[PDB]
Amino acid sequence: MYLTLQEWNARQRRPRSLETVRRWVRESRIFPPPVKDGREYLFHESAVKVDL
Amino acid sequence: SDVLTVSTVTQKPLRDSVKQALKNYFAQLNGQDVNDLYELVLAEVEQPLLDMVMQYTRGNQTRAALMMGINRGTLRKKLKKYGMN
Amino acid sequence: SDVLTVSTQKPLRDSVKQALKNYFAQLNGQDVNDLYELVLAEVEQPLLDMVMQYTRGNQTRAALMMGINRGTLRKKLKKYGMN
DNA sequence: AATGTTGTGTTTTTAACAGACTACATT
DNA sequence: AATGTAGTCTGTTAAAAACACAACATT
């Protein structure tokens, strides 16, 4: 049920650039916040972008 | 049925053009010893593919790496190899 | 002057160039995401086919011919189903 | 009989990978 | 304002390498 940043971005309504979505993670704009196992982030299926 | 083909006029798969280019390369082999035939075939094929994708994205590296399914860094490192920046 | 050529003698890089120009045209709006492995597989399968006929099934000779590890050769052969 | 090759493990090394982040451009 | 890109960096890790060797093969 955990996807990579690459996969989760594609599943979204409007997929953005990888560098932007990584900034979203850096700026905590995605809940639930994804853990970082090793070199990559693991998103949850349900995760969305909360508008601060 | 094959996705990558050339025009010869019949549509021959690219695997044929490689098979024929090695049969010709093996015939030219006047007893010489081949020690890095992989790097030689790869360099002859990476350089054209890099040129064509980069042309298609109009020089957008990110769109080009995303196209080939490779890291943007290894795209940049392979462009530096074949001297394309 | 080019080591790898196909029959006038045109280099192999030209045959690749024409194949992609043909590929890009056929793409009716489809999105590409794996073009490298698609091309590499179309080139690794014949080159393995050729040095295996050249060394007559001698894996050790074929691997040294290409400049790759013998296991790497074995691994790529298992990939394209050349057991 | 001697010598090379396969099959298949180890262990080390190289190369790809995802990401961070800034200056600048595009939307 | 938010997003996209190039360029330059970090880490993590998977591919590739080097090597070892009893088995079977070739000469």
Curated annotation (Swiss-Prot), chain A:
Domain of life: Viruses
Keywords on record: DNA recombination, DNA-binding, Viral genome excision
Known function: Part of the excision complex necessary for the excision of prophage from the host genome by site-specific recombination at the att site.
Protein name: Excisionase
Gene designation per UniProt: xis
GO terms, molecular function: DNA binding; identical protein binding
High-level lineage: Viruses, Duplodnaviria, Heunggongvirae, Uroviricota, Caudoviricetes
Assembly description: Interacts (via C-terminus) with the integrase (via N-terminus). Part of the excision complex made of the integrase tetramer, IHF, Fis and Xis.
A GO biological process held by the record: provirus excision
From Swiss-Prot, chain C:
Coiled coil, from the record: none
Annotated region described as Required for the stimulation of HIN-mediated recombination, given as residue ranges: 8-29
Compartments where located: Cytoplasm, Nucleoid
Keywords, ordered alphabetically: Activator, Cytoplasm, DNA-binding, Transcription, Transcription regulation
KW Nucleus (keyword) present: no
DNA-binding interval(s): 59-78
Paired cysteines (S-S): none
Entry annotated with the keyword Transferase: no
InterPro entries: Fis_DNA-bd, Homeodomain-like_sf, HTH_Fis, Trans_regulatory_Fis
GO BP terms, alphabetized: chromosome organization; DNA-templated transcription; positive regulation of DNA recombination; provirus excision; regulation of DNA-templated transcription; response to radiation
GO molecular function: core promoter sequence-specific DNA binding; DNA binding; DNA-binding transcription activator activity; DNA-binding transcription repressor activity; protein homodimerization activity; sequence-specific DNA binding; sequence-specific DNA binding, bending; transcription cis-regulatory region binding
Assembly mode: Homodimer.
Alphabetical list of HAMAP family matching this protein: DNA_binding_Fis
Function: Activates ribosomal RNA transcription, as well other genes. Plays a direct role in upstream activation of rRNA promoters. Binds to a recombinational enhancer sequence that is required to stimulate hin-mediated DNA inversion. Prevents initiation of DNA replication from oriC. Binds to hundreds of transcriptionally active and inactive AT-rich sites, approximately half its binding sites are in non-coding DNA, which only accounts for about 10% of the genome.
Name of the protein described by the UniProt record: DNA-binding protein Fis
Organism: Escherichia coli (strain K12)
